[PDB]
Amino acid sequence: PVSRRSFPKGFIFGTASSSYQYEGGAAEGGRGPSIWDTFTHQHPEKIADRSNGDVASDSYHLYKEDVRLMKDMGMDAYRFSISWTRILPNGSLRGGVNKEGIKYYNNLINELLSKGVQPFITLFHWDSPQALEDKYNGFLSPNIINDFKDYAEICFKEFGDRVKNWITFNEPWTFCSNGYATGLFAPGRCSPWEKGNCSVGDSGREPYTACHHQLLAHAETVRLYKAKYQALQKGKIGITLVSHWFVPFSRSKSNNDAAKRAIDFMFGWFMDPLIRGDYPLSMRGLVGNRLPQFTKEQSKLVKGAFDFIGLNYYTANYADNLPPSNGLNNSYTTDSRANLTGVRNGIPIGPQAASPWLYVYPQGFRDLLLYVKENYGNPTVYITENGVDEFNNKTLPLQEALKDDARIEYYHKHLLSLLSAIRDGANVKGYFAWSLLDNFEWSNGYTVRFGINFVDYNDGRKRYPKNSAHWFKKFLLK
Ligand SMILES: [Zn+2]
């Protein structure tokens, strides 16, 4: 069949979570508001079930139970994120350090290590400080860089004696496209005609400005870590990027070039700068002056600025050539001149999960990993997220909700697909399942469940292992 035994010796298995989706205690322990507190409370129409992360999965109180669950599966590692506003309630150093917040993350870190689970920490998982949003529009201003740098530094000082694995940003693609092009995610900015129908924004500039600043904050932080912390702490620092796999809509060459543009715009947007020191040619060509430019100093800094790359994979799309549109309607969403669908002639590329955008296509996992090997020099890679969701359904009896054979099937195929890619050259060192628990799934609220364990939101946030948890327990033996 397949088990951890099939994978290289020393290969790491774990689960992933994020602060805002899991923690709750949104206003406890001195936590300041994030742009997602604001977004969920001020724009409930923009959340499927009009909900928020106030309580979420209550990991702020329940983290000991969480650790116990992952130890029982036999996980090696846990990827979680630190809430910026839990450490610095208004984003900046001069705003004050929150000692109760530090205490929380020490508690979790120590709990994890006491059970032999390695902590991998994400610094930014979208919960950007409201105070910095109000002050200078957050990631739209270059001031974000030094504030982020100071926040990372406090984390290295407080936790770096025990934490040896650091991720700066999680899926900057999703943050920038949904936060600034579609406006469907916090901070909910977009051009007035775009899907989010936002009161402020510019879908043709802001996504590029925000992500340019994320890259610079990342590289700056990497340099800081390598200069002051890596010698005496000996940890690794990286970044998490998401990519779909893009299948050409037909065998034509223009559709093959469309697929290439799709991956350049989603993935290369961040990979090209890190490997080659510049944005992809196609982006520079098609976007011109709306895409900011690295100085030579900055180009030098970003190139090679990582020890590993975290890769998130979920699904694949068909990529179809799009004619230009254009001139007044410029948006990041259409800038690639590619049309992405999950359906071709009424036939979905794979079976569709609870999330409309998620099609089950294990073949694409292999394809993406080999593409990274061949086009980017085969960098050290962790799979930082991979998973699937079922609907939250109030009518199902508990015992039925725990029967998640679709999830088992998803992981089985995807772990086989990952194995075959490793058996070819893929430089993959670990894998993290999204996610340990059902959680706040952003604009979908609690309408969907990604967890390997069930969370009863109506019964005190109780955790119940799903069938897939028992499956992982077997998969992870010895
Ligand atoms: Zn509680």
Side-chain angles (χ1 to χ4, degrees):
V2 66
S3 74
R4 86 181 298 149
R5 268 152 277 125
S6 323
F7 284 78
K9 183 270 150 192
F11 189 90
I12 283 145
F13 288 100
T15 58
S17 68
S18 89
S19 57
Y20 191 76
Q21 310 180 260
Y22 267 61
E23 274 171 29
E28 282 165 49
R31 187 173 170 280
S34 77
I35 56 162
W36 269 94
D37 299 81
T38 312
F39 189 77
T40 50
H41 285 274
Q42 291 204 41
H43 296 271
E45 338 79 51
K46 281 178 172 170
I47 311 301
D49 56 6
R50 311 190 103 256
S51 75
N52 54 69
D54 283 3
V55 172
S57 289
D58 204 31
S59 299
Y60 191 66
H61 303 156
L62 296 182
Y63 72 100
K64 277 176 172 172
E65 289 188 359
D66 303 354
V67 171
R68 210 192 66 253
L69 293 179
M70 67 182 82
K71 180 59 192 179
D72 293 335
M73 292 162 93
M75 293 290 167
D76 309 309
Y78 189 43
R79 171 169 177 248
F80 68 95
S81 80
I82 288 168
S83 184
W84 192 334
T85 59
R86 208 182 270 293
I87 312 295
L88 297 167
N90 53 61
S92 70
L93 191 44
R94 64 187 184 275
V97 184
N98 183 18
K99 282 146 84 96
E100 204 166 339
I102 289 156
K103 170 169 72 258
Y104 171 68
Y105 291 113
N106 276 323
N107 282 345
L108 167 63
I109 292 167
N110 296 337
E111 189 71 12
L112 288 155
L113 289 177
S114 83
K115 291 192 167 40
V117 183
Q118 278 171 73
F120 281 58
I121 299 177
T122 303
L123 288 174
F124 186 81
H125 203 129
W126 312 346
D127 48 347
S128 201
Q130 189 54 53
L132 305 175
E133 204 73 17
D134 298 334
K135 193 152 91 196
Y136 55 66
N137 303 310
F139 275 90
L140 294 178
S141 160
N143 304 347
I144 198 75
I145 301 160
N146 264 75
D147 283 326
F148 183 75
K149 194 170 88 202
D150 295 346
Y151 155 62
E153 184 149 35
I154 292 158
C155 293
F156 303 151
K157 285 179 192 174
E158 292 301 310
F159 310 121
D161 66 294
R162 284 150 293 138
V163 184
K164 304 297 168 200
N165 288 286
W166 293 105
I167 299 165
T168 57
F169 296 87
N170 170 78
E171 306 188 4
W173 173 84
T174 316
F175 183 82
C176 296
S177 59
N178 281 348
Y180 299 88
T182 62
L184 295 178
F185 277 19
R189 281 181 171 259
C190 64
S191 288
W193 53 90
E194 203 86 339
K195 324 202 238 298
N197 200 30
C198 322
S199 70
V200 277
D202 180 357
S203 298
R205 294 185 180 273
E206 284 183 17
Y208 298 115
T209 307
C211 264
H212 193 251
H213 291 319
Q214 289 218 333
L215 276 171
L216 291 176
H218 165 258
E220 201 70 65
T221 300
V222 172
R223 192 225 265 149
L224 173 66
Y225 185 78
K226 294 192 170 296
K228 281 179 68 178
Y229 297 97
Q230 197 165 47
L232 309 193
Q233 292 182 349
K234 300 205 183 297
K236 294 291 170 218
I237 194 157
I239 181 173
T240 286
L241 304 180
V242 59
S243 192
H244 299 330
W245 181 250
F246 299 97
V247 184
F249 189 82
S250 76
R251 279 178 192 160
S252 97
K253 204 225 173 204
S254 72
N255 290 328
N256 275 257
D257 298 332
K260 185 76 178 58
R261 284 191 315 277
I263 190 144
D264 285 1
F265 272 73
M266 188 179 194
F267 186 59
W269 193 6
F270 312 102
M271 280 296 270
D272 277 282
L274 292 159
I275 281 86
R276 285 149 211 175
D278 222 319
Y279 290 121
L281 285 152
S282 73
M283 288 189 85
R284 213 128 24 80
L286 312 191
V287 172
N289 80 319
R290 291 187 287 108
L291 189 60
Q293 291 229 307
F294 298 112
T295 64
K296 265 139 187 200
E297 291 80 7
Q298 293 171 347
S299 185
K300 196 203 204 317
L301 189 65
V302 173
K303 183 191 192 195
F306 67 97
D307 296 308
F308 63 89
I309 284 136
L311 210 9
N312 291 8
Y313 178 86
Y314 286 96
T315 196
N317 291 342
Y318 294 113
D320 189 43
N321 184 45
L322 258 184
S325 48
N326 58 304
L328 269 162
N329 279 283
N330 286 340
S331 173
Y332 170 82
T333 307
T334 56
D335 276 346
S336 76
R337 301 189 191 185
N339 182 49
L340 317 170
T341 56
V343 180
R344 170 215 261 161
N345 281 313
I347 319 299
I349 189 162
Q352 200 186 244
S355 278
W357 56 265
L358 204 170
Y359 307 87
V360 177
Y361 190 76
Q363 174 77 65
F365 199 18
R366 175 188 168 80
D367 294 331
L368 177 58
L369 289 163
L370 296 172
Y371 174 92
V372 167
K373 179 193 184 296
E374 283 145 39
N375 292 262
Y376 293 106
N378 200 28
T380 303
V381 163
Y382 288 91
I383 309 299
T384 43
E385 273 175 46
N386 184 58
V388 71
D389 62 337
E390 81 257 339
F391 282 109
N392 186 355
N393 180 5
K394 52 163 196 180
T395 80
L396 284 195
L398 193 30
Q399 62 191 140
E400 286 306 333
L402 308 167
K403 284 171 195 157
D404 62 340
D405 283 297
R407 176 164 292 104
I408 288 161
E409 193 193 55
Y410 183 94
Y411 282 112
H412 182 79
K413 277 160 176 157
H414 280 271
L415 283 158
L416 277 172
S417 185
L418 163 77
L419 187 55
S420 71
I422 294 170
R423 290 192 193 292
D424 304 306
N427 196 17
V428 185
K429 297 289 211 179
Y431 174 94
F432 292 84
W434 183 265
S435 60
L436 176 74
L437 306 169
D438 298 336
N439 61 76
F440 179 76
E441 176 50 31
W442 310 113
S443 71
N444 264 328
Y446 302 92
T447 65
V448 293
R449 303 180 172 277
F450 270 95
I452 302 169
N453 306 278
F454 186 100
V455 172
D456 201 330
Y457 303 105
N458 299 306
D459 207 28
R461 276 69 47 186
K462 274 169 194 167
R463 290 94 167 86
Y464 300 93
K466 291 173 203 177
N467 286 354
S468 61
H470 297 94
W471 191 86
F472 272 108
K473 193 171 171 42
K474 288 171 164 163
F475 177 93
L476 297 162
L477 287 164
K478 93 200 58 160

PDB file of all heavy atoms in Angstrom, residues 219 264 316 330 387 409 468:
ATOM      1  N   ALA A 219      12.688  39.055   2.333  1.00  0.00           N
ATOM      2  CA  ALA A 219      14.145  39.105   2.124  1.00  0.00           C
ATOM      3  C   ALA A 219      14.889  39.837   3.245  1.00  0.00           C
ATOM      4  O   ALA A 219      15.943  39.388   3.701  1.00  0.00           O
ATOM      5  CB  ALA A 219      14.472  39.726   0.776  1.00  0.00           C
ATOM      6  N   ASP A 264       3.316  31.376 -14.135  1.00  0.00           N
ATOM      7  CA  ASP A 264       4.175  32.549 -13.951  1.00  0.00           C
ATOM      8  C   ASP A 264       3.522  33.579 -13.029  1.00  0.00           C
ATOM      9  O   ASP A 264       4.176  34.124 -12.141  1.00  0.00           O
ATOM     10  CB  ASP A 264       4.509  33.221 -15.287  1.00  0.00           C
ATOM     11  CG  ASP A 264       5.545  32.457 -16.099  1.00  0.00           C
ATOM     12  OD1 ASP A 264       5.992  31.393 -15.637  1.00  0.00           O
ATOM     13  OD2 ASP A 264       5.913  32.922 -17.212  1.00  0.00           O
ATOM     14  N   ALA A 316      -6.030  21.676  -9.512  1.00  0.00           N
ATOM     15  CA  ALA A 316      -5.585  22.084 -10.835  1.00  0.00           C
ATOM     16  C   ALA A 316      -6.693  22.826 -11.591  1.00  0.00           C
ATOM     17  O   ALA A 316      -7.871  22.647 -11.292  1.00  0.00           O
ATOM     18  CB  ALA A 316      -5.144  20.873 -11.610  1.00  0.00           C
ATOM     19  N   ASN A 330      -8.030  47.009 -16.323  1.00  0.00           N
ATOM     20  CA  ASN A 330      -6.877  46.247 -15.861  1.00  0.00           C
ATOM     21  C   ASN A 330      -7.007  45.761 -14.419  1.00  0.00           C
ATOM     22  O   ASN A 330      -7.263  46.537 -13.502  1.00  0.00           O
ATOM     23  CB  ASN A 330      -5.591  47.045 -16.058  1.00  0.00           C
ATOM     24  CG  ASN A 330      -5.166  47.120 -17.516  1.00  0.00           C
ATOM     25  OD1 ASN A 330      -5.577  46.304 -18.347  1.00  0.00           O
ATOM     26  ND2 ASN A 330      -4.320  48.094 -17.827  1.00  0.00           N
ATOM     27  N   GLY A 387      -4.679  19.334   1.354  1.00  0.00           N
ATOM     28  CA  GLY A 387      -5.893  18.803   1.967  1.00  0.00           C
ATOM     29  C   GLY A 387      -7.157  19.071   1.188  1.00  0.00           C
ATOM     30  O   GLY A 387      -7.110  19.594   0.074  1.00  0.00           O
ATOM     31  N   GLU A 409      -9.331   9.058   0.740  1.00  0.00           N
ATOM     32  CA  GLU A 409      -9.036   8.884  -0.680  1.00  0.00           C
ATOM     33  C   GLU A 409      -8.137   9.992  -1.210  1.00  0.00           C
ATOM     34  O   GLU A 409      -7.181   9.719  -1.938  1.00  0.00           O
ATOM     35  CB  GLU A 409     -10.319   8.784  -1.511  1.00  0.00           C
ATOM     36  CG  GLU A 409     -10.072   8.305  -2.928  1.00  0.00           C
ATOM     37  CD  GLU A 409     -11.268   8.501  -3.838  1.00  0.00           C
ATOM     38  OE1 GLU A 409     -11.756   9.652  -3.947  1.00  0.00           O
ATOM     39  OE2 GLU A 409     -11.712   7.506  -4.457  1.00  0.00           O
ATOM     40  N   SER A 468     -10.180   9.603   8.985  1.00  0.00           N
ATOM     41  CA  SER A 468      -8.878   9.942   8.416  1.00  0.00           C
ATOM     42  C   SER A 468      -7.769  10.072   9.462  1.00  0.00           C
ATOM     43  O   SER A 468      -6.599   9.866   9.144  1.00  0.00           O
ATOM     44  CB  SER A 468      -8.972  11.204   7.554  1.00  0.00           C
ATOM     45  OG  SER A 468      -9.393  12.316   8.319  1.00  0.00           O
TER      46      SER A 468
END
